Design an enzyme around this catalytic site. Structure first.
Site, PDB file in Angstrom:
ATOM      1  N   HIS A 132      15.330  28.433  61.812  1.00  0.00           N
ATOM      2  CA  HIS A 132      15.856  27.749  60.627  1.00  0.00           C
ATOM      3  C   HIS A 132      16.446  26.371  60.952  1.00  0.00           C
ATOM      4  O   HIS A 132      16.792  25.624  60.048  1.00  0.00           O
ATOM      5  CB  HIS A 132      16.838  28.621  59.804  1.00  0.00           C
ATOM      6  CG  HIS A 132      18.233  28.713  60.366  1.00  0.00           C
ATOM      7  ND1 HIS A 132      18.679  29.764  61.147  1.00  0.00           N
ATOM      8  CD2 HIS A 132      19.296  27.886  60.211  1.00  0.00           C
ATOM      9  CE1 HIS A 132      19.948  29.555  61.465  1.00  0.00           C
ATOM     10  NE2 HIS A 132      20.348  28.435  60.896  1.00  0.00           N
TER      11      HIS A 132
ATOM     12  N   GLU B  79      27.532  18.262  76.668  1.00  0.00           N
ATOM     13  CA  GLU B  79      28.488  17.817  75.658  1.00  0.00           C
ATOM     14  C   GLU B  79      29.755  18.652  75.610  1.00  0.00           C
ATOM     15  O   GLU B  79      29.689  19.893  75.712  1.00  0.00           O
ATOM     16  CB  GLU B  79      27.875  17.869  74.259  1.00  0.00           C
ATOM     17  CG  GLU B  79      26.823  16.817  73.975  1.00  0.00           C
ATOM     18  CD  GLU B  79      27.428  15.466  73.660  1.00  0.00           C
ATOM     19  OE1 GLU B  79      26.705  14.627  73.081  1.00  0.00           O
ATOM     20  OE2 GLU B  79      28.613  15.256  73.999  1.00  0.00           O
TER      21      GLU B  79
ATOM     22  N   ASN C 236      33.068  16.832  73.541  1.00  0.00           N
ATOM     23  CA  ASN C 236      33.271  16.082  72.314  1.00  0.00           C
ATOM     24  C   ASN C 236      31.957  15.383  71.932  1.00  0.00           C
ATOM     25  O   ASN C 236      31.492  14.481  72.633  1.00  0.00           O
ATOM     26  CB  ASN C 236      34.409  15.072  72.462  1.00  0.00           C
ATOM     27  CG  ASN C 236      34.818  14.504  71.114  1.00  0.00           C
ATOM     28  OD1 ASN C 236      33.968  14.143  70.300  1.00  0.00           O
ATOM     29  ND2 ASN C 236      36.112  14.458  70.853  1.00  0.00           N
TER      30      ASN C 236
ATOM     31  N   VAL D 214      32.255  11.424  71.341  1.00  0.00           N
ATOM     32  CA  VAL D 214      32.780  10.555  72.383  1.00  0.00           C
ATOM     33  C   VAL D 214      31.912  10.727  73.614  1.00  0.00           C
ATOM     34  O   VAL D 214      31.620  11.866  74.007  1.00  0.00           O
ATOM     35  CB  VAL D 214      34.238  10.945  72.756  1.00  0.00           C
ATOM     36  CG1 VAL D 214      34.760  10.063  73.870  1.00  0.00           C
ATOM     37  CG2 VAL D 214      35.161  10.838  71.560  1.00  0.00           C
TER      38      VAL D 214
ATOM     39  N   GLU E 106      27.020  13.755  79.756  1.00  0.00           N
ATOM     40  CA  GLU E 106      25.920  14.005  78.829  1.00  0.00           C
ATOM     41  C   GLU E 106      24.548  13.668  79.398  1.00  0.00           C
ATOM     42  O   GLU E 106      24.411  12.755  80.221  1.00  0.00           O
ATOM     43  CB  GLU E 106      26.094  13.133  77.597  1.00  0.00           C
ATOM     44  CG  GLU E 106      27.344  13.421  76.755  1.00  0.00           C
ATOM     45  CD  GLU E 106      28.583  12.611  77.126  1.00  0.00           C
ATOM     46  OE1 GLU E 106      28.617  11.943  78.183  1.00  0.00           O
ATOM     47  OE2 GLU E 106      29.541  12.673  76.322  1.00  0.00           O
TER      48      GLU E 106
ATOM     49  N   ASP F 252      13.849  34.670  63.602  1.00  0.00           N
ATOM     50  CA  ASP F 252      14.490  33.359  63.527  1.00  0.00           C
ATOM     51  C   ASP F 252      14.738  32.798  64.933  1.00  0.00           C
ATOM     52  O   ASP F 252      15.863  32.813  65.471  1.00  0.00           O
ATOM     53  CB  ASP F 252      15.781  33.490  62.722  1.00  0.00           C
ATOM     54  CG  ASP F 252      16.432  32.157  62.439  1.00  0.00           C
ATOM     55  OD1 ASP F 252      15.763  31.107  62.592  1.00  0.00           O
ATOM     56  OD2 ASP F 252      17.611  32.164  62.037  1.00  0.00           O
TER      57      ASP F 252
ATOM     58  N   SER G 107      31.015  33.239  63.554  1.00  0.00           N
ATOM     59  CA  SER G 107      30.337  31.941  63.584  1.00  0.00           C
ATOM     60  C   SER G 107      30.112  31.464  62.134  1.00  0.00           C
ATOM     61  O   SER G 107      30.420  32.193  61.171  1.00  0.00           O
ATOM     62  CB  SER G 107      29.024  32.016  64.358  1.00  0.00           C
ATOM     63  OG  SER G 107      28.119  32.954  63.790  1.00  0.00           O
TER      64      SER G 107
ATOM     65  N   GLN H 210      28.257  27.947  59.475  1.00  0.00           N
ATOM     66  CA  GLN H 210      27.336  26.819  59.366  1.00  0.00           C
ATOM     67  C   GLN H 210      27.624  25.782  60.444  1.00  0.00           C
ATOM     68  O   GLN H 210      28.791  25.479  60.751  1.00  0.00           O
ATOM     69  CB  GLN H 210      27.407  26.164  57.971  1.00  0.00           C
ATOM     70  CG  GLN H 210      26.592  26.883  56.877  1.00  0.00           C
ATOM     71  CD  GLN H 210      27.157  28.232  56.477  1.00  0.00           C
ATOM     72  OE1 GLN H 210      28.377  28.428  56.425  1.00  0.00           O
ATOM     73  NE2 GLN H 210      26.268  29.182  56.198  1.00  0.00           N
ATOM     74  N   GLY H 211      26.548  25.278  61.045  1.00  0.00           N
ATOM     75  CA  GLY H 211      26.656  24.296  62.107  1.00  0.00           C
ATOM     76  C   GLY H 211      26.623  24.957  63.488  1.00  0.00           C
ATOM     77  O   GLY H 211      26.343  24.290  64.494  1.00  0.00           O
TER      78      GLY H 211
ATOM     79  N   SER I 175      24.574  27.498  63.858  1.00  0.00           N
ATOM     80  CA  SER I 175      23.148  27.846  63.811  1.00  0.00           C
ATOM     81  C   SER I 175      22.393  27.492  65.062  1.00  0.00           C
ATOM     82  O   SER I 175      22.471  26.350  65.511  1.00  0.00           O
ATOM     83  CB  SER I 175      22.486  27.037  62.695  1.00  0.00           C
ATOM     84  OG  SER I 175      22.797  27.547  61.411  1.00  0.00           O
ATOM     85  N   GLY I 176      21.635  28.453  65.591  1.00  0.00           N
ATOM     86  CA  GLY I 176      20.776  28.180  66.718  1.00  0.00           C
ATOM     87  C   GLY I 176      21.473  28.312  68.045  1.00  0.00           C
ATOM     88  O   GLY I 176      20.776  28.359  69.078  1.00  0.00           O
TER      89      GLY I 176
HETATM   90  C1  LIG Z   1      20.135  29.443  56.975  1.00  0.00           C
HETATM   91  C2  LIG Z   1      21.233  30.522  56.956  1.00  0.00           C
HETATM   92  N1  LIG Z   1      21.330  31.106  55.619  1.00  0.00           N
HETATM   93  C3  LIG Z   1      22.235  32.045  55.363  1.00  0.00           C
HETATM   94  O1  LIG Z   1      23.031  32.428  56.205  1.00  0.00           O
HETATM   95  C4  LIG Z   1      22.183  32.623  53.986  1.00  0.00           C
HETATM   96  N2  LIG Z   1      23.529  32.874  53.414  1.00  0.00           N
HETATM   97  C5  LIG Z   1      21.342  33.913  53.980  1.00  0.00           C
HETATM   98  C6  LIG Z   1      19.842  33.698  54.341  1.00  0.00           C
HETATM   99  C7  LIG Z   1      19.051  34.992  54.154  1.00  0.00           C
HETATM  100  C8  LIG Z   1      18.970  35.935  55.179  1.00  0.00           C
HETATM  101  C9  LIG Z   1      18.278  37.133  55.009  1.00  0.00           C
HETATM  102  C10 LIG Z   1      17.656  37.380  53.782  1.00  0.00           C
HETATM  103  O2  LIG Z   1      16.969  38.570  53.583  1.00  0.00           O
HETATM  104  C11 LIG Z   1      17.739  36.449  52.735  1.00  0.00           C
HETATM  105  C12 LIG Z   1      18.416  35.249  52.936  1.00  0.00           C
HETATM  106  C13 LIG Z   1      22.539  29.900  57.405  1.00  0.00           C
HETATM  107  O3  LIG Z   1      23.203  29.233  56.626  1.00  0.00           O
HETATM  108  N3  LIG Z   1      22.874  30.084  58.700  1.00  0.00           N
HETATM  109  C14 LIG Z   1      24.112  29.545  59.242  1.00  0.00           C
HETATM  110  C15 LIG Z   1      25.140  30.650  59.391  1.00  0.00           C
HETATM  111  C16 LIG Z   1      25.487  31.463  58.303  1.00  0.00           C
HETATM  112  C17 LIG Z   1      26.440  32.458  58.466  1.00  0.00           C
HETATM  113  C18 LIG Z   1      27.036  32.666  59.712  1.00  0.00           C
HETATM  114  C19 LIG Z   1      28.040  33.761  59.916  1.00  0.00           C
HETATM  115  N4  LIG Z   1      28.802  34.133  58.951  1.00  0.00           N
HETATM  116  N5  LIG Z   1      28.097  34.360  61.114  1.00  0.00           N
HETATM  117  C20 LIG Z   1      26.695  31.870  60.806  1.00  0.00           C
HETATM  118  C21 LIG Z   1      25.753  30.850  60.637  1.00  0.00           C
HETATM  119 CA   LIG Z   2      30.132  13.595  74.286  1.00  0.00          CA
END
Ligand SMILES: C[C@H](NC(=O)[C@H](N)CCc1ccc(O)cc1)C(=O)NCc1ccc(C(=N)N)cc1
Ligand SMILES: [Ca+2]
Length: 223
Positions: free
Chosen positions: A40, A52, A54, A57, A62, A84, A172, A174-175, A177-178
């Protein structure tokens, strides 16, 4: 990362930042030429930033290296986040040192109750937003598959696991991710999805990397 702590500079030397003008995802260095992240996180224009702390900065450790190829898992389903996972090859090999280091892939899966380290530059608030500039860390256990499926009915597949705390407060976000979930020296998870962040009965959901080791190894050997 919500409810975590400041890792300390370069204490997670396999953690990378994916940058397309700005940090947008984490990833994990698995050898000098390859990073694994979430499907994703796929986009064009990726620069991998290694060493990395900071991210705003230049601190002196790096390495910035452009991606030459990205490979999203052949079975990735963006509707369900099944499979994913994505591999990114670097245009040139990173110079491996104490601050820029690979992490081992699983030799087998991990069990419920195993403790892991999750890290990233994602949101630190469970309501609203605040983005840190230094790397954050969280220790969290793998949760049983049954509690995972009960928390997220109709959405957990065999390629996912939950980790964290059902009570809320530590997760964890948003941000992140991955980025990595490392347990007993192995990259067992990738930050994938969840409902909100750090909410009660809504733990983090992570890509189950042990299912993908054969694919990762064969893909790297052929590319
Ligand atoms: C792209 C992903 N989307 C979602 O998470 C949606 N809410 C459900 C997707 C979705 C998944 C399965 C399905 O069947 C349908 C939709 C996302 O934003 N990941 C960052 C994240 C999100 C949460 C956390 C956390 N709380 N640990 C960490 C990083
Ligand atoms: Ca840096």
């Amino acid at each position: 990362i919500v409810g975590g702590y400041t890792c300390g500079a370069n204490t997670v030397p396999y953690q990378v930042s994916l940058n397309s003008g700005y940090h947008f995802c984490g990833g994990s260095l698995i050898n000098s030429q390859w990073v694994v992240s979430a499907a994703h996180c796929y986009k064009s224009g990726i620069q991998v930033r290694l060493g990395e702390d900071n991210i705003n900065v230049v601190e002196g450790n790096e390495q910035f290296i452009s991606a030459s190829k990205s490979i999203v898992h052949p079975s990735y389903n963006s509707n369900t986040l099944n499979n994913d996972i994505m591999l990114i090859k670097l245009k040139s090999a990173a110079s491996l040192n104490s601050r820029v280091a690979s992490i081992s892939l699983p030799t087998s899966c991990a069990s419920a109750g195993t403790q892991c380290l999750i890290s990233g530059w994602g949101n630190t608030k469970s309501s609203g937003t605040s983005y840190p500039d230094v790397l954050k860390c969280l220790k969290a256990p793998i949760l049983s598959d049954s509690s995972c499926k009960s928390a997220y009915p109709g959405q957990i597949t065999s390629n996912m696991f939950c980790a964290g705390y059902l009570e809320g407060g530590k997760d964890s976000c948003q941000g992140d991710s991955g980025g990595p979930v490392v347990c007993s020296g192995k990259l067992q998870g990738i930050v994938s999805w969840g409902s909100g962040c750090a909410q009660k009965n809504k733990p983090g959901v992570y890509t189950k990397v042990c299912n993908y080791v054969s694919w990762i190894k064969q893909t790297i050997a052929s590319n």
